[PDB]
Design a protein around this ligand. Sequence first.
Ligand SMILES: [Mg+2]
Ligand SMILES: [Mg+2]
Ligand SMILES: [Mg+2]
Ligand SMILES: [Mg+2]
Ligand SMILES: [Mg+2]
Ligand SMILES: [Mg+2]
Ligand SMILES: [Mg+2]
Ligand SMILES: [Mg+2]
Ligand SMILES: [Mg+2]
Ligand SMILES: [Mg+2]
Ligand SMILES: [Mg+2]
Ligand SMILES: [Mg+2]
Ligand SMILES: [Mg+2]
Ligand SMILES: [Mg+2]
Ligand SMILES: [Mg+2]
Ligand SMILES: [Mg+2]
Ligand SMILES: [Mg+2]
Ligand SMILES: [Mg+2]
Ligand SMILES: [Mg+2]
Ligand SMILES: [Mg+2]
Ligand SMILES: [Mg+2]
Ligand SMILES: [Mg+2]
Ligand SMILES: [Mg+2]
Ligand SMILES: [Mg+2]
Ligand SMILES: [Mg+2]
Ligand SMILES: [Mg+2]
Ligand SMILES: [Mg+2]
Ligand SMILES: [Mg+2]
Ligand SMILES: [Mg+2]
Ligand SMILES: [Mg+2]
Ligand SMILES: [Mg+2]
Ligand SMILES: [Mg+2]
Ligand SMILES: [Mg+2]
Ligand SMILES: [Mg+2]
Ligand SMILES: [Mg+2]
Ligand SMILES: [Mg+2]
Ligand SMILES: [Mg+2]
Ligand SMILES: [Mg+2]
Ligand SMILES: [Mg+2]
Ligand SMILES: [Mg+2]
Ligand SMILES: [Mg+2]
Ligand SMILES: [Mg+2]
Ligand SMILES: [Mg+2]
Ligand SMILES: [Zn+2]
Ligand SMILES: [Zn+2]
Ligand SMILES: [Zn+2]
Lengths: 98, 127, 81, 96, 214, 153, 91, 25
Amino acid sequence: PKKRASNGRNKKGRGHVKPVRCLNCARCVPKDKAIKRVTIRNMVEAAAVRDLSEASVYAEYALPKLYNKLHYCVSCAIHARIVRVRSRTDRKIRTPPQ
Amino acid sequence: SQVFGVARIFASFNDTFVHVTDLSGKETIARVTGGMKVKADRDESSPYAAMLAAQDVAAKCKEVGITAVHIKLRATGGTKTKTPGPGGQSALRALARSGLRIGRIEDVTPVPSDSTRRKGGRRGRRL
Amino acid sequence: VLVQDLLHPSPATEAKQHKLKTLVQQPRSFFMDVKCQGCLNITTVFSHAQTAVTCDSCSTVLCTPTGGKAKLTEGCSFRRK
Amino acid sequence: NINSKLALTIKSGKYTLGYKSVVKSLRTGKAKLVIIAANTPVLRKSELEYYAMLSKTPVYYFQGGNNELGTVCGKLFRVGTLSILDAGDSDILSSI
Amino acid sequence: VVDPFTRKDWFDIKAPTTFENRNVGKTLINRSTGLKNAADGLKGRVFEVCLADLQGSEDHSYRKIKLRVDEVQGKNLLTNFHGLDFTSDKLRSLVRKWQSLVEANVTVKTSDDYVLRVFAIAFTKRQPNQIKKTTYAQSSKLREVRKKMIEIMQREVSNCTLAQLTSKLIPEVIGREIEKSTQTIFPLQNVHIRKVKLLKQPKFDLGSLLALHG
Amino acid sequence: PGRGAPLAKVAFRDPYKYKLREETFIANEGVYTGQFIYAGKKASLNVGNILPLGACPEGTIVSNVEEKVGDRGALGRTSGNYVIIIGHNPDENKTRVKLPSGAKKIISSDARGVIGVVAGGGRIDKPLLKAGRAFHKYKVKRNSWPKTRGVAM
Amino acid sequence: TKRTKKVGITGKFGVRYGSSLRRQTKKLEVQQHAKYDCSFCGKRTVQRGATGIWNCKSCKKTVAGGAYTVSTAAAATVRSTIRRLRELAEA
Amino acid sequence: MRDKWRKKRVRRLKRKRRKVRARSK
RNA sequence: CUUGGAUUUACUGAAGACUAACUACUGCGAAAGCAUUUACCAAGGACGUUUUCAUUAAUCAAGAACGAAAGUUAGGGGAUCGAAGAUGAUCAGAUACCGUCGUAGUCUUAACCAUAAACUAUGCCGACUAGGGAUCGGUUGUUGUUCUUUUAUUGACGCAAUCGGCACCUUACGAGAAAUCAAAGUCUUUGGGUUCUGGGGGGAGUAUGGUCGCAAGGCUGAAACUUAAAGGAAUUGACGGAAG
Ligand SMILES: [Mg+2]
Ligand SMILES: [Mg+2]
Ligand SMILES: [Mg+2]
Ligand SMILES: [Mg+2]
Ligand SMILES: [Mg+2]
Ligand SMILES: [Mg+2]
Ligand SMILES: [Mg+2]
Ligand SMILES: [Mg+2]
Ligand SMILES: [Mg+2]
Ligand SMILES: [Mg+2]
Ligand SMILES: [Mg+2]
Ligand SMILES: [Mg+2]
Ligand SMILES: [Mg+2]
Ligand SMILES: [Mg+2]
Ligand SMILES: [Mg+2]
Ligand SMILES: [Mg+2]
Ligand SMILES: [Mg+2]
Ligand SMILES: [Mg+2]
Ligand SMILES: [Mg+2]
Ligand SMILES: [Mg+2]
Ligand SMILES: [Mg+2]
Ligand SMILES: [Mg+2]
Ligand SMILES: [Mg+2]
Ligand SMILES: [Mg+2]
Ligand SMILES: [Mg+2]
Ligand SMILES: [Mg+2]
Ligand SMILES: [Mg+2]
Ligand SMILES: [Mg+2]
Ligand SMILES: [Mg+2]
Ligand SMILES: [Mg+2]
Ligand SMILES: [Mg+2]
Ligand SMILES: [Mg+2]
Ligand SMILES: [Mg+2]
Ligand SMILES: [Mg+2]
Ligand SMILES: [Mg+2]
Ligand SMILES: [Mg+2]
Ligand SMILES: [Mg+2]
Ligand SMILES: [Mg+2]
Ligand SMILES: [Mg+2]
Ligand SMILES: [Mg+2]
Ligand SMILES: [Mg+2]
Ligand SMILES: [Mg+2]
Ligand SMILES: [Mg+2]
Ligand SMILES: [Zn+2]
Ligand SMILES: [Zn+2]
Ligand SMILES: [Zn+2]
């Protein structure tokens, strides 16, 4: 039977969406279907943010961030626990996790 | 004040390059890779190998007169991954803890404005 | 609402309806008498005019057509007929 | 746009089509405008505008060839040049 | 076997007077020998230094300047402007979702015949009283803004020499004028000249260059 | 006869004595009878004009190009072929061009060429279909056809 | 009536030379015997002489063209490219 | 077997029948 | 692949592709599809309209136009990936998955092909039946808001209506075997108009004839024979080299 009303993608009123390659396995996946996560991480791990600030030649220099947008296909994301299997009724919930 | 070089760190998932040049980048001062510190291929990109590689780089810098460096970290880029390898974080901390002074830090990963086909095929690499 | 006076809708709610969706369809447009500031000559102008109307005396554009109602130029006063 | 104005003159006014009629119409001073096709030979062109300079007649240079000038006038033949004798319901003379 | 660093001679890099802290740093090259002079193989080098370093202030931390050496006087290197660029992280921090990104570029030559390509970038501004999630501008307005960018960069470059323009880039004169000039089109934020490239240089004039070094 | 490219006969005046000089140029496509041909350093970029290589910007399509200054045309003379100007070296007065074989050549910037593509192109697209057609083709070229295979002697 | 279903002008060649050579010949041989529009007088009276030679019967102007068409695509591309490059050079 | 490969098997087998029948043309 | 200096580094140049980030349960198109700027060319829906014509219309065998990718023919291009092929591994075996090379192809110009899970597995036109909040395009009334420029005749934003779209949320009058459905409702209380298709499972989209195609193949399309099930949705369990 039909498992999801959205067919696992985000294509409505559209014929074709150009594909993207998965970061993990380089599989061609439609842009609307890919599981996308935006991550803004510190470029230096919190253990080294002190000694690198002390080693800085600049007083009060702010470390730049690392901006990245990751694209995954369905097999990579499920395997890497980026998304998880939800119950039949819990699948419908599409608000971001709290 | 300080005498700056440029530490061009290329951290892939198979190796870690610690490469210090001058300001122009046309003159190479020290290039120690994580593969020169281990005899196993599987840990050429290990954080441990990158730390040893950075210390050898820092030691070479001191005897030439380089007292501070700017950091230009990069990943493989191109059609491949844009996140830096595990050795890039260790080589930066090792350089700072070795008495070398740190200047500007920048990510200089080459990023296409949409470009060539990536290896692996349509169905990806099946594992 | 099961019981409702369809033959005598409230004139307030009747005016919010689309022009084709009233009991009897009726245009919301009208005709205006336009006084340009320069002179005084009655000129009948449609509210939703599609033409750059010019008064006979001086060849000055009175209004510019838009998507909906025509826009009267500055100094031009209108009175609905 | 100028084509729409010219079509009305052909429909309502008076005109002559062709090089021999245009030169005759320039001699008599009955021409209000001379229209020359883009692919008209330059020698004929530079001669038509010498007659128009003498006749004191403005000249409009059609952008298409004599194949396109003929069909604008509603004709099934080629028109290398034409003269407008009477602009009628149109306002082509006021638009050069 | 030979330790190639025994034959290196150190030189000092001097920035033009348009900046404040003109002592950029030091470089090295193989020592001048009979066959090859150190001077000729040293000119043409490009140094990429942060604009915050050339001015002290951290407000220029997101711009980095390329300096091209084209005259050597003993141990001093006389550099010139070679290009402008933003840091990668600054641009990535400006490109958010639920908003429109607009870019423009134009090729234009200065008064002294320096051919440049100048890249402008801007983003739609969310109004203080705005309620809707996204801030999108209609494509017709974006075409007018893009057109407005191009005619401002063309005007403010062709009317001045490269040195005055360098003094224009530091305070975002062009970016502030674009923001002011597009107020009646659409509210804008983060209007920046994010990159400048030198394409073609005029015939070398050492005297003109020397005036930019004191 | 013997050429795929048509030839153009162009009449010039003699600058020093009262006489007409008829030249035989290779016709570029688009050149017509009665057309004015301009030749020299100051000639304009029009089809059929003869210009020095330095006066033509990159990407200019040119034919009958001089290999050496004053040899009156050596390169790109057959039907459908041409030379693309790749770039200039004004300090050494040299120009880089791309030849019909795909080779890049460096020629003096004073060498001349004719603007356009040699007329008659697309000739090879049609099969000859007959031995007689090749016989008539080589009847006005030279005695090189037909060829006996060396393995059959 | 319609005399040949598909050979057309290549019916003069009978059954010889192979279908691929005959249909490839037919395409290019219709073009070389066609009448083209004259850019000078406007009539469709231009016909080929030898290869590269296209004459107009009316105004007697001869223009150098392609082997089988009055103008090739490469020349048309060069004509607009030269026109475009001419505008920049002459401002 | 897979429906797609069953179709390919028959397509290749249809090809053989046509070539075999052509012998007695 | 590397002391014949690889990999790396800075600067420079050349080729082809491709247009990241902005990019969304957003837009446009009959569908396939469409994402750098500008210029040119001709189109298009919606909205507005006290403009115009008056049944011109709805759906449509036959027949046309278009029709992803791959593929065919001939030129041109051939950066990157990469069928075939070659190779290093793995394995009991592995012609494969993984790794390294790589030819057609991938791009383009002239023609062919006419097929895709070409999907919404859901024909089109018309009417009605229920609430709600968003959003795109247009129109009409109106702000403790920001801004042109100092304000308007700037533009943005805010609040209401409305027509049209892409969708979404709730309910079930109602439908259904259920999964589910604002249509898949207004169907034993059975009839608004109209086009196409199916009749247990296989054999089989097979054989044959016809027709289109250069070919690969496309369209139309049986019979003999065989069988009591095959299948759909859901429930419990069992199992899973799935998650918590
Ligand atoms: Mg399932
Ligand atoms: Mg649509
Ligand atoms: Mg599709
Ligand atoms: Mg699709
Ligand atoms: Mg998804
Ligand atoms: Mg490795
Ligand atoms: Mg390695
Ligand atoms: Mg080792
Ligand atoms: Mg492979
Ligand atoms: Mg797996
Ligand atoms: Mg005529
Ligand atoms: Mg405006
Ligand atoms: Mg010769
Ligand atoms: Mg012989
Ligand atoms: Mg032989
Ligand atoms: Mg032979
Ligand atoms: Mg013998
Ligand atoms: Mg007969
Ligand atoms: Mg047999
Ligand atoms: Mg090297
Ligand atoms: Mg949009
Ligand atoms: Mg883009
Ligand atoms: Mg049909
Ligand atoms: Mg295709
Ligand atoms: Mg195709
Ligand atoms: Mg193809
Ligand atoms: Mg080919
Ligand atoms: Mg290739
Ligand atoms: Mg490869
Ligand atoms: Mg293989
Ligand atoms: Mg084996
Ligand atoms: Mg196809
Ligand atoms: Mg689908
Ligand atoms: Mg709206
Ligand atoms: Mg009111
Ligand atoms: Mg304004
Ligand atoms: Mg405006
Ligand atoms: Mg039955
Ligand atoms: Mg049956
Ligand atoms: Mg059978
Ligand atoms: Mg056939
Ligand atoms: Mg039984
Ligand atoms: Mg089941
Ligand atoms: Zn993947
Ligand atoms: Zn008036
Ligand atoms: Zn003619």
